Design a protein around this nucleic acid. Structure first.
Length: 48
DNA sequence: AGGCCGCTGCTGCTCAAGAGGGGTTCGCGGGACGGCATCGGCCAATTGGCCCGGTGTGTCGCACGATCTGG
């Protein structure tokens, strides 16, 4: 997801489709894209 | 003379023209049917008038009369 949103979307998507890659949503960009709490600052589970 | 190991040039991807025939729609009307909507009566029913008939208790309109403050 992050690689596709950076640049060269077509190549990244056609490479990820063949390998059947699974995204675990650990970064900041993916959490921003799907619309949930980023895993930093006040979005950590230690504080909430 | 074929196979193969590199070079080297080239290219590509990405960031800034009528006519006939037939089933179907809808669109007007067109009226028929059934239905619910609108108008003289109407009497004896709860509330609320509207009073008789007793006093009393308590406000108000005024008489006798004492105390007190000012004049």
């Amino acid at each position: 997801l992050s690689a596709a949103s950076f640049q060269e979307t077509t190549r990244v998507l056609t490479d990820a489709a063949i390998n059947a890659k699974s995204d675990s949503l650990i970064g900041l960009k993916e959490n921003v894209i799907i619309g949930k709490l980023i895993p930093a600052g006040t979005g950590l589970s230690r504080y909430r």
